[PDB]
Amino acid sequence: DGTILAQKLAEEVPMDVASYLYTGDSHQLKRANCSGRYELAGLPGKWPALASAHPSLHRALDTLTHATNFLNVMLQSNKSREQNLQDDLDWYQALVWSLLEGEPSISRAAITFSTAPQVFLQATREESRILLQDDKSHFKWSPPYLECENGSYKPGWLVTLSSAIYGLPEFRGVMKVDINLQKVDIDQCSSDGWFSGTHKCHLNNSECMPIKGLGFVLGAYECICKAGFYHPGVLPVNNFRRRGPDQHISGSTKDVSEEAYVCLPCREGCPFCADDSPCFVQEDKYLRLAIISFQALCMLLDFVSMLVVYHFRKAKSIRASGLILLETILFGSLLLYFPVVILYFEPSTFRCILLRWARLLGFATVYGTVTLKLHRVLKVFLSRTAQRIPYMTGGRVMRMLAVILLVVFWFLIGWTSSVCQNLEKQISLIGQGKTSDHLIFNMCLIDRWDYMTAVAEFLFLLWGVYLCYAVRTVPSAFHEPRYMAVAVHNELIISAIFHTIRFVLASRLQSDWMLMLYFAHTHLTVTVTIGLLLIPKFSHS
Amino acid sequence: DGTILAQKLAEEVPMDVASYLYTGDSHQLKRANCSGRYELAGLPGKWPALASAHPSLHRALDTLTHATNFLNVMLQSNKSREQNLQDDLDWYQALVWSLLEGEPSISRAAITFSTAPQVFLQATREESRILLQDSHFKWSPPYLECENGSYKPGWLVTLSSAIYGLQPEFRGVMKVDINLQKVDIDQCSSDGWFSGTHKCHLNNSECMPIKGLGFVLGAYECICKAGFYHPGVLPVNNFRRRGPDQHISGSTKDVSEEAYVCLPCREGCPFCADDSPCFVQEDKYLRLAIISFQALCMLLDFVSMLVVYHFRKAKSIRASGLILLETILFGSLLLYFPVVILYFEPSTFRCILLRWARLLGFATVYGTVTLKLHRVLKVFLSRTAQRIPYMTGGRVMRMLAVILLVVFWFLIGWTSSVCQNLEKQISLIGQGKTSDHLIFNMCLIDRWDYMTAVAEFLFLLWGVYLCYAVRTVPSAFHEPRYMAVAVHNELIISAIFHTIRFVLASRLQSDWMLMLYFAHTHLTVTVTIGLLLIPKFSHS
């Protein structure tokens, strides 16, 4: 509640607000019979002890205490009554006038000495001439004092400190010391040692800090509070709340100057200002919507293709292929159709693992039965010429392929287990990449193992390439080996190109570009494989 | 260097060191002349007001200047006859008294007022009477009374200032004294009075550079002569802990005002005892012959390879073929290098060789034995129908080449992946305890070695099934009967050893690990290369 006190107390003191926020106005003032006479400073206390008023004030009250100790001598001195002789008058006029030069910050002083008032008053600093005009103890203080007269004038605020002089029934007299405070400032308007101790910060901190984490509204002096004295080297900094990426952020938006407001601004996704274009990369729908619809359509068509094959058996053309083998190939491809749909969402960890788990099993089920079928053809040919036909339809090929499936399962299990152990230390999965324009995007990193899988598929397919080379004169009824040759070479070339491209230009590619390339490669290899191995089964009879 | 000068200054003043070692001294014995006019003051010459020893002296000098300002005001009083009446004489000495009770600590004071001495002085604080005798605030060194003995005072200063006169120099001063007995005597660091910043016998000149963060002070750096009193700052003596390194707390020897040693409690770890906790005990009765014996096994295996190189006839071995038995007798060497490697410190290069050797050795030995056992079965199942497709080296070897390719590939992948996280964490050379707070250096488990443990188990399952198949085939030299043992042994012992090694990972000593490795290696491998070889030179 300390903050609002100043605002509500401004309307009991006309013309004064302009003086605090503009000290120099006094020059043009000819109104206000008497200026401010008493201002409420009790929120921190009656008066700040050990204040931040510099040692100056401490040493001033110390000189006053020494002086009063001096006057606390002749109250009891023997025969020290006299009759106010001229020498005694000189001593009296000197004893406090000396106090002036001992502190650069003491205004006029005086001594009452009621017996003949005999009071003396002095002029300003560095030029002072005495003038004579005809219960409680321990240095009681007082509120700031204003010379009423018929204005306020430049001097403005001075504190009227005083104490008492006891005698041998007190003396009904005191000593007056005045302290100039124009040269001192407020306690940075946020500390706890003066008028505005951790208060008078209208619409800052509590209003701008809780939400704005690390708002830092002060820096060196928050919420310039009253001024009026001067503008010293404390550097009173207003609207200093930066907040970094905080929801309030800089907030250099509106309600500037004394009427501070507009705490909430310049915070969208990253530590920037004035909207959300920075950092986040542009997202399009024309290259992120039709793609998935097309992929789903192709998937559904493949499903219906599997079914129709289930509906055709007696066509001897397929009989050579074998129902089980072709169904396995189609399912392998269907499974291979999930590196794009997975890329359509945010790159989590579960998805970033699902991607490899799908790609590897597909790339092993599809071109792990074509190669074996070519092998079976080659072996049967090389054996028939010498009294032998060992191989047979599904039942041998599938069992042999089970070995490749076992090896792939094993490697994937090892890789998954190893990856979900380092999560305690580092993730190294969901990284951020730049694109030469100070924009960050979230992607999945390279594991240094994918380099190995890329070359593993290449080496494996070399075996199929050699098979293709060997079988070139075998009489075939439906030219199936001729077709599968394309399905092998095409992959050997494309997959290599796509892998190298994806690896080199890895971080320099936005998410949408990655999706485009993935879809391109998938529909340039897998679709060709399905089409080549299937279409020539319902035609060319 | 001021330390050395202070030590020299110690021996130029009789019966004086004991005052700083012990405050009283005169309390038991004070028999000396006017001694202690000046000892060191301050290493940087003097302190006008710098080094800030308590604010009490700040306020003292401030009151001094303030009071002298009064007199400076009473310099050119107009028509000041100053006849020195009873009231005139009263005023000045009343002021002199007044200057007293404004501060806690202060001693006698006096005013000369040379017009006729007119010198007025009083006693210490809280006890003042009147005694008459018959620029820029210059300082002075510590003072002591000289009329007889030394007694209590103990280095009270004699600050004073003068006053000016006009119509020249009045030749008058306002003397004050300050008792410094009740004052903290510096901290022997962070240069102040009587002590510039190191100021003791080898605070760090012998120990700290060896071990940084010595922490000699904590709150009071290597408490110095002191002597004025014992303040509440807890003068810290020999407080330099320094944790590890030779510079330590060093609670060993030479513990006194001269404790220059501070040289101990440094053996391998941040402890004080002799090296023993940091490094577990090593034996030689166990860690020495274990390598000599394995060297002998290796040399015998090499000579046995040669011996087979010198026997090609004796058809008994023809059924196995030179090209294959040689491969086995070589794969064995590779398998024989998990012990010699473990004989040295666990670096990273060695901690990688440990897998590179083991995996290749295995894939060779039980990648050729299994294939031979498969060839026998195939030939048997084929001859019963007109067919003999298989053949010795040239057929088995290329089939084994596939296993070697796969193993090479996996090892390359694993090595590359493990020499990439070294930028962040090493996760290779770790340490563990054994329930008695003992640390030792070992190689940890990669979470991939679990997979390699089960891979060989699955592989040898194929071998055991082969063994189950070939049971009634007529064999000339019972070779399959032999190889069955070589397969089951490594099915069982290998699994047991792997589980034991993995579960008791960190709770096992280094020498204990060496013992277990040697036991396992010589309980399976030797049986393999002795069972497949010995019969070839007997049972003819």
Added chain:
Amino acid sequence: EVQLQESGGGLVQAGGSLRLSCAASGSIGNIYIMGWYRQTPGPQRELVATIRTVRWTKYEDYADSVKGRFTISDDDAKNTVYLQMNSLKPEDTAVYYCNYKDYNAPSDGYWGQGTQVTVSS
């Protein structure tokens, strides 16, 4: 607080002399006041007086009726203070009570012990 000590026993006739030694053992010397509260409320030959004002150059604060009477000036009040029986008279027959001041005492002038003295003409 202080443990005053009164020592003034002994028979004495008029014109004799004696010392009552009020000692402020638990305190310091010239720091407190005296005045010797007495039970006798009707002394026709005046009573005891006070000395020193606050702390300053111990002064004679007699009421002009005790100047030629009991000498409480003491050799130096920065010690045990002796009160003397100048021109002793029969009215002194009573018990003496030393008293203190300087405030900061719940009683501020209470007595702790007592010496009874008998004096005749």
Added chain:
Amino acid sequence: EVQLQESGGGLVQAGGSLRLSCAASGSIGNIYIMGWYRQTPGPQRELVATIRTVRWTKYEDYADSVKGRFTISDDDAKNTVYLQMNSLKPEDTAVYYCNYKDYNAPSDGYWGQGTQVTVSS
């Protein structure tokens, strides 16, 4: 270091008067001293006057020979420091020089203007 402004021109006879004020425009009033160095070093009829004692309770600095001569005064917060030419003499002819004496002025002070006056009998 104050530019003292001397204004004392004018032809005056013996017995006339003139206010030659060395105003301290660059400073404030009664803080310095004067003494008016003059070109003629041989005044047989006594010397120029001076007043004020810097800051301590302004005092009449006449040397017991200028009391019946040029008279000077101020008005507290009055920088104008005039010296009326009481009982003017033929020797008055010279160039007067108000000066500084407060501090950093070992060999007296210095002047910043010269007034050429002429007085006859």
